[PDB]
């Protein structure tokens, strides 16, 4: 089964093709995880992915997306990560990390508490930041900060100061996060992209932010250890044959940049799109930006079936299948996809107490 | 659903019935649990289920099956609990524990690593004690110590011991292990009790141990607290009718000396039988101990279908039902039951985090 085939990249090595991509848990305080964490991802590595990479962890408090979110902003907070870091080795699964800063949607509400932006008096918010003030609307109505060179500068160390600190809690992987809407896809975007100045206005200017934050992490990142993004590479906003050329221009100059694989997701920049949901419907996107930028790349939104895993590989749509809810729904899914496509000695996917019995 | 419905016996309520019983992770080390338990446990309380049972936990070092066995024969052992009993609680969870002897079946191979006694020149094993000098056979042919009565009287003060430090390390729920073929089913057992004493011979010998173990516990443990036992109420050996009328008189006993719920299995005191495997196969004898014994009880061995389940609970053959080798598939079985089942809100077995993503 290709699913079940190793995967090399730099000096790390995947027992398979199962990537858990990140997924917020919302459980933190004050950006510190704690022990809903460290069980939540050593029984996932447990349940034999070959890749598990750990949420969207914020580069600075007003990155995080609600005050549930991790954060990596002090040594203190990375040294939180060390033993999660030392249970998913032990599981034999490879500890990556995605960082990031929410930009203007920030300051929201945990998914089950509103999902909206956190109303003006209540003494958790705060002032969010982005290229241009310009709100994202709908429930996320809050209008940005404007950032200044200064803050530019700031938030880019911050991503640097966040990957070394990811270096030294023992990561193998690192993901920048330039996805979703969030800090990075909006300086990409020109629907939040109004600047004037270097950071704005034509495709090299809306790079910038990106390739010079990728560049700075490039400094402190291991050249041995797989470095990474995720990107939005279209919207569904009906621009979308012109935003992919865009993106896989830059995917072109991420690679040039030392990026070894790209996760291939979708902008979410603004609300009002028409995403075509369904499995596997990232397949074909993804396996154009491979062919088209020559990297290796990952996706998710519904790859969550072993055969659909298993197509996408051997179709060369995608490197790795990222497997997310059904990771909630069943932390030991790796298993489950190997008995369904009949590998063999299948239960040792899992760890030995556990593999022994289900023979 | 029957299934789940809340359960309350003493002071403390289930939130269904679907126990995860005990079941050895060969994974400690000279008895002490470590991040291998806590994970694993924690991450079973998290699937939904309404109690979990740690695994068989030796009550003296010499009581152990293996040398992955935990144990609880030190107050150091005791307190390497702590965390993991709260971690369950905050899950939502009921902890238990079983607190075990393997009499003549200890000092054995890991499953995966022989399953048989361990060698007499291999630096991990040791003398096994029991009723009388008769080996179990097979893979385990060691010819166990003859007890005396100091022995007797030790082990009798080792499980209140265990019992003490069970309800000092914060467990809400206590299993006295006497089924499967280990110390306390083999007093009971006339295969392997051939003592003149007052500990064999007559119905009432046999029993004794067993009686004088549970009153001694009962001195320690709190009585709103469960207080439980297993144990093999047949052994396909072909006197099963003799067998069984034995057992349910002891099952009298029990009830009457203070047991609040009987787990009902097989004895495999012996190799020589014929146990007939099959889906909910001991169901009918658990509904005829439960009903001539009046006593509630749990049993397993093919219950692990979320129908098979919710029938035995229908037909009142159980008051939970026990699950053991699907969990170890996958520690989200209670979600599952549930979405088979139709229950409303059926994501919402498992916490938020979860939960919010998968309705
Ligand atoms: C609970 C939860 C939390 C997050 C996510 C999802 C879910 C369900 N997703 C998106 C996720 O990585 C993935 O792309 C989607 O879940 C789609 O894949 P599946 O169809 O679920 O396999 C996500 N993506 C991301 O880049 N960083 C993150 O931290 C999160 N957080
Ligand atoms: C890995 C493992 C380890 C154990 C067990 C089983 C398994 C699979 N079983 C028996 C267990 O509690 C249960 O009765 C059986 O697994 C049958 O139920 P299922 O058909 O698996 O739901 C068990 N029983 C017991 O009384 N104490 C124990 O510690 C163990 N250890
Ligand atoms: O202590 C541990 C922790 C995790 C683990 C995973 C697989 C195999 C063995 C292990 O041991
Ligand atoms: O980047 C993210 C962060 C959170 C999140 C939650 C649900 C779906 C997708 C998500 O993406
Ligand atoms: O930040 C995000 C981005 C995408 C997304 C998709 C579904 C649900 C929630 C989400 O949140
Ligand atoms: O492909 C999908 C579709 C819906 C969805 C909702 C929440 C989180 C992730 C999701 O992924
Ligand atoms: O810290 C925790 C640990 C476990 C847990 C389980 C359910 C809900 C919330 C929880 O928080
Ligand atoms: O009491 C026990 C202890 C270990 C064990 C292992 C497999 C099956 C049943 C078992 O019962
Ligand atoms: O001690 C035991 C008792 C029962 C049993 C059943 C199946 C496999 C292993 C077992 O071990
Ligand atoms: O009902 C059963 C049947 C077989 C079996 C084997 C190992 C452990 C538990 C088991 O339970």
Same mark, same amino acid.
């Given at each position: ?66 005050? !549930? ?33 929410? !930009? ?140 992919? *050329? ?45 062919? *088209? ?50 590998? *063999? ?15």
């Amino acid at each position: 089964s290709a699913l079940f085939e190793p995967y090399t990249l730099k000096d790390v090595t995947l027992r398979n093709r199962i990537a858990i991509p990140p997924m917020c848990q919302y459980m933190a305080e004050d950006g510190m995880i704690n022990d809903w964490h460290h069980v939540h991802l050593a029984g996932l590595a447990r349940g034999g992915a070959g890749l598990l990479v750990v949420e969207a962890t914020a580069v600075a408090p007003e990155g995080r997306i609600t005050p !549930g979110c991790a954060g990596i902003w002090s040594d203190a907070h990375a040294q939180a990560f060390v033993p999660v870091v030392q249970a998913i080795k032990a599981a034999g699964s490879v500890p990556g990390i995605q960082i990031a800063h929410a !930009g203007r949607k920030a300051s929201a509400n945990r998914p089950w508490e509103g999902d909206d932006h956190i109303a003006a008096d209540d003494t958790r918010g705060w002032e969010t930041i982005a290229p241009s003030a310009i709100a994202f609307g709908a429930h996320l109505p809050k209008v940005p900060r404007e950032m200044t060179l200064d803050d530019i500068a700031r938030v880019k160390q911050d991503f640097v100061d966040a990957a070394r600190r990811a270096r030294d809690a023992g990561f193998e992987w690192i993901e920048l996060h330039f996805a979703h809407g969030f800090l990075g896809q909006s300086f990409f975007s020109e629907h939040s992209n109004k600047r004037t100045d270097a950071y704005g206005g034509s495709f090299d200017n809306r790079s910038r932010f990106l390739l010079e934050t990728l560049a700075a992490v490039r400094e402190v990142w291991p050249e041995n250890l797989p470095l990474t993004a995720r990107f939005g590479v279209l919207e569904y906003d009906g621009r979308d044959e012109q935003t992919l *050329e865009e993106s896989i221009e830059l995917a072109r100059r991420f690679k040039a940049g030392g990026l070894d694989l790209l996760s291939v997701s979708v902008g979410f920049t603004i609300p009002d799109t028409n995403i075509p949901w369904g499995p596997a419907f990232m397949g074909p996107i993804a396996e154009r930006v491979r062919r *088209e930028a020559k990297l290796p790349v990952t996706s998710a939104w519904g790859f969550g079936t072993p055969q659909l895993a298993e197509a996408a590989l051997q179709a060369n749509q995608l490197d790795l299948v990222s497997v997310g809810r059904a990771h909630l729904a069943d932390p030991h899914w790796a298993y489950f996809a190997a008995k369904e496509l009949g590998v *063999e000695k299948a239960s040792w996917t899992l760890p030995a107490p556990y593999a022994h019995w289900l023979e």
